[PDB]
Design an enzyme around this catalytic site. Structure first.
Site, PDB file in Angstrom:
ATOM      1  N   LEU A 157     -38.730  15.197  59.466  1.00 52.37           N
ATOM      2  CA  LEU A 157     -39.806  15.739  58.667  1.00 52.37           C
ATOM      3  C   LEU A 157     -40.485  16.750  59.697  1.00 52.37           C
ATOM      4  CD1 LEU A 157     -41.017  12.556  56.925  1.00 52.37           C
ATOM      5  CD2 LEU A 157     -39.392  14.404  55.879  1.00 52.37           C
ATOM      6  N   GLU A 200     -47.818   7.490  53.500  1.00 52.40           N
ATOM      7  CA  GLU A 200     -47.134   8.167  52.562  1.00 52.40           C
ATOM      8  C   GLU A 200     -45.857   7.654  52.405  1.00 52.40           C
ATOM      9  OE1 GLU A 200     -45.207  10.363  50.816  1.00 52.40           O
ATOM     10  OE2 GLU A 200     -44.495  10.556  53.055  1.00 52.40           O
TER      11      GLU A 200
HETATM   12  N1  LIG Z   1     -40.209  15.972  52.662  1.00 55.16           N
HETATM   13  C1  LIG Z   1     -39.429  15.046  52.085  1.00 55.16           C
HETATM   14  O1  LIG Z   1     -39.729  14.659  50.946  1.00 55.16           O
HETATM   15  C2  LIG Z   1     -37.983  15.314  52.412  1.00 55.16           C
HETATM   16  C3  LIG Z   1     -37.488  15.897  53.456  1.00 55.16           C
HETATM   17  N2  LIG Z   1     -36.136  15.759  53.802  1.00 55.16           N
HETATM   18  C4  LIG Z   1     -35.615  16.254  55.000  1.00 55.16           C
HETATM   19  O2  LIG Z   1     -34.716  17.282  54.476  1.00 55.16           O
HETATM   20  C5  LIG Z   1     -33.627  17.651  55.549  1.00 55.16           C
HETATM   21  C6  LIG Z   1     -32.236  17.177  54.602  1.00 55.16           C
HETATM   22  O3  LIG Z   1     -32.159  18.259  53.564  1.00 55.16           O
HETATM   23  P1  LIG Z   1     -31.116  19.367  53.212  1.00 55.16           P
HETATM   24  O4  LIG Z   1     -30.981  19.885  54.583  1.00 55.16           O
HETATM   25  O5  LIG Z   1     -31.584  20.087  52.301  1.00 55.16           O
HETATM   26  O6  LIG Z   1     -29.772  18.460  53.171  1.00 55.16           O
HETATM   27  P2  LIG Z   1     -29.122  17.642  52.022  1.00 55.16           P
HETATM   28  O7  LIG Z   1     -29.709  16.154  52.230  1.00 55.16           O
HETATM   29  O8  LIG Z   1     -29.304  17.725  50.480  1.00 55.16           O
HETATM   30  O9  LIG Z   1     -27.733  17.521  52.457  1.00 55.16           O
HETATM   31  C7  LIG Z   1     -26.792  18.664  51.960  1.00 55.16           C
HETATM   32  C8  LIG Z   1     -25.589  18.189  51.988  1.00 55.16           C
HETATM   33  O10 LIG Z   1     -25.286  17.431  50.957  1.00 55.16           O
HETATM   34  C9  LIG Z   1     -24.234  17.370  49.970  1.00 55.16           C
HETATM   35  N3  LIG Z   1     -24.940  17.947  48.936  1.00 55.16           N
HETATM   36  C10 LIG Z   1     -26.191  18.139  48.670  1.00 55.16           C
HETATM   37  N4  LIG Z   1     -26.407  18.554  47.428  1.00 55.16           N
HETATM   38  C11 LIG Z   1     -25.083  18.492  46.616  1.00 55.16           C
HETATM   39  C12 LIG Z   1     -24.549  18.443  45.211  1.00 55.16           C
HETATM   40  N5  LIG Z   1     -25.524  18.888  44.248  1.00 55.16           N
HETATM   41  N6  LIG Z   1     -23.371  18.083  45.301  1.00 55.16           N
HETATM   42  C13 LIG Z   1     -22.757  17.736  46.212  1.00 55.16           C
HETATM   43  N7  LIG Z   1     -22.942  17.621  47.513  1.00 55.16           N
HETATM   44  C14 LIG Z   1     -24.308  17.976  47.718  1.00 55.16           C
HETATM   45  C15 LIG Z   1     -23.622  18.541  50.630  1.00 55.16           C
HETATM   46  O11 LIG Z   1     -22.571  17.780  51.605  1.00 55.16           O
HETATM   47  P3  LIG Z   1     -21.294  18.354  51.980  1.00 55.16           P
HETATM   48  O12 LIG Z   1     -21.453  19.615  53.149  1.00 55.16           O
HETATM   49  O13 LIG Z   1     -20.550  17.275  52.830  1.00 55.16           O
HETATM   50  O14 LIG Z   1     -20.674  18.936  50.731  1.00 55.16           O
HETATM   51  C16 LIG Z   1     -24.623  19.548  51.275  1.00 55.16           C
HETATM   52  O15 LIG Z   1     -24.267  19.926  52.705  1.00 55.16           O
HETATM   53  C17 LIG Z   1     -33.958  16.798  56.666  1.00 55.16           C
HETATM   54  O16 LIG Z   1     -34.674  17.668  57.339  1.00 55.16           O
HETATM   55  C18 LIG Z   1     -34.862  15.498  55.917  1.00 55.16           C
HETATM   56  O17 LIG Z   1     -35.575  14.943  56.838  1.00 55.16           O
HETATM   57  C19 LIG Z   1     -35.004  15.026  52.849  1.00 55.16           C
HETATM   58  C20 LIG Z   1     -35.598  14.216  52.002  1.00 55.16           C
HETATM   59  C21 LIG Z   1     -36.778  14.440  51.430  1.00 55.16           C
END
Ligand SMILES: NC(=O)C1=CN([C@@H]2O[C@H](COP(=O)(O)OP(=O)(O)OC[C@H]3O[C@@H](n4cnc5c(N)ncnc54)[C@H](OP(=O)(O)O)[C@@H]3O)[C@@H](O)[C@H]2O)C=CC1
Ligand SMILES: [Ca+2]
Length: 186
Positions: free
Chosen positions: A22, A30
């Site tokens: 984060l 939160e």
């Molecule tokens: N502030 C908040 O509320 C939140 C913050 N966070 C933060 O966000 C970051 C992680 O988020 P982000 O980078 O966007 O990554 P994601 O957690 O969405 O991971 C992305 C991976 O997930 C898979 N993926 C994602 N969407 C799909 C789909 N629709 N179908 C299939 N596979 C999918 C793929 O994996 P593959 O490459 O293996 O296909 C893609 O590379 C971190 O910094 C975390 O701390 C996360 C959640 C909530």
């Protein structure tokens, strides 16, 4: 699935993450909010399901995985099998929805929560299904490298009140934030 719920915390730049974690240091209240909202089922004998992307799963400390009292589903187009500790692996949001609708799941599951990241939120927001988005707006700017997708304000209407969601601006560790609930009706 009749309806989806998504939960996120964003800062003023619509940022959600920085370097795998984060953008802001820890906010106890939160976190408690996230835990309570995602874990609380309105039905005995059932549990909520949470769907998350692969980088979000691995962002959780290993010893805290899977998120207790919820069925954890990870999305990944690359993994062959569910990561150690996850309950199910799906290759798209659609597959995960289907899964949930299945026999075994269907009776075991109460609410479905989308817990990020970006592409997961975006895919859920595009489905023509009833959806509630629980946003925590942190009223400060932090450096971020990952952002929340744009929400269609014509579709998602901001509620002025919601049962069990404080209305007032909150403050913790010198930071202020507000809870908002948006709702799309299909
Ligand atoms: N502030 C908040 O509320 C939140 C913050 N966070 C933060 O966000 C970051 C992680 O988020 P982000 O980078 O966007 O990554 P994601 O957690 O969405 O991971 C992305 C991976 O997930 C898979 N993926 C994602 N969407 C799909 C789909 N629709 N179908 C299939 N596979 C999918 C793929 O994996 P593959 O490459 O293996 O296909 C893609 O590379 C971190 O910094 C975390 O701390 C996360 C959640 C909530
Ligand atoms: Ca990849």
């Amino acid at each position: 699935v009749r309806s989806l719920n998504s939960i996120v915390a964003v800062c003023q730049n619509m940022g959600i993450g920085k370097d795998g974690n984060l953008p802001w240091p820890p906010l106890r209240n939160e976190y408690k909010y996230f835990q309570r909202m995602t874990s609380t089922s309105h039905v005995e004998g059932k549990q909520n399901a949470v769907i998350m992307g692969k980088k979000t799963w691995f962002s959780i400390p290993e010893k805290n995985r899977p998120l207790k009292d919820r069925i954890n589903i990870v999305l990944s187009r690359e993994l062959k099998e569910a990561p150690k500790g996850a309950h199910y692996l799906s290759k798209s949001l659609d597959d995960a929805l289907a899964l949930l609708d299945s026999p075994e799941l269907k009776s075991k599951v109460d609410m479905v929560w989308i817990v990020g990241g970006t592409a997961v939120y975006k895919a859920a927001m595009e489905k023509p299904i009833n959806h509630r988005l629980f946003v925590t707006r942190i009223l400060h700017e932090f450096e971020s490298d990952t952002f929340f997708p744009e929400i269609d304000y014509k579709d998602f209407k901001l509620l002025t009140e919601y049962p069990g969601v404080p209305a007032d601006i909150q403050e913790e560790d010198g930071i202020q934030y507000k809870f908002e609930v948006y709702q799309k009706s299909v």
